[model samples]
Target: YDIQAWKKQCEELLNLIFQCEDSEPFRQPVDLLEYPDYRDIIDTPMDFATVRETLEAGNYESPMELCKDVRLIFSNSKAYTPSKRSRIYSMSLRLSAFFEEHISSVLSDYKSALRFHKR
Candidate 1:
C-alpha cells in the first residue's frame, strides 16, 4: 500500500482502539495503593491490582461494563470509607459519593442508549 493509504489506516485503527478502551467511572488506571487517600474496601491491595490489571488488559465485555463496576465502588462508598469525614475536608469522600451517583446515572443511560440494539 502507498504511504498515504497506510497512514489513513493507522489513524482509523487508533480511533477504533480508543473507542474500545475500557470505561471506568471515577478512577483511571491509577496506582491506588500509592496514593495516600485512594481508599479501597479492604486491605487486599494486591488482589485489587490483579483484577484491575486483568480488566485493563482488554478482558472485560465492554467499556460500559467496567464503568458499572467503578460506579459501584462509589455508590457503596461506605465500604471504602476513609478515616476522615468533615464537610469541608473530611466529607470529601462522602460528598463525592453524591456526585458518583449523578455521574453513573447519566453514563448508565448513555450506555443504555448505545447498546447494540439501542440504535
Candidate 2:
C-alpha cells in the first residue's frame, strides 16, 4: 500500500467530514494535523501524534480501516472538554469498542478474500 495514497484518501475523507469544498477539500497533507478550534478541549497534539504513528506503521491492509480508527479517535478527542472529562472519557471508550469491532471485521474480510484467491 502506498503511504502517500493512504494519506491522501484519509485527508479527503476528513475534509468531507469537515464540510470542505469538493474543489479544494485539502490544501496539503499536513493540514489534517492542524489543531481544531477546540484544541484546548483535549490534548490535540498527542492524539494526532498517536494516529500519525499508527498510520506510519503501515501494517493495515486497507487504508479505510486505519482511517476508521483515526476518525473515531479524532471524534472522541473532539468531544473532550475540561469540565466534561468523564463524559469525554466514556465516549472515547465507546469509540474504542466500535473501532475494535470494525478492525475485526476488516481482518476477517481480508482473510476470507485471501482464502478465495488461493482456490
Best by lDDT: 2
lDDT of 2 by residue, 31-114 (tens): 335535545454333343444456567655565566555664545454643444555455545554544454454445555666
Give candidate 1's total backbone clashes.
2
Candidate 1 lDDT score at position 61: 49
Clashes of each: 2, 0
| Lowest lDDT block of 10, candidate 1 | 1-10
Evaluate model 1: give its TM-score.
0.31
Query: Which segments of model 2 are wrong by more than 4 Å?
Result: 1-85
TM-score of each: 0.31, 0.34
Q: Which regions of candidate 1 fall more than 4 Å away from where they truly are?
A: 1-55, 75-77, 80-119
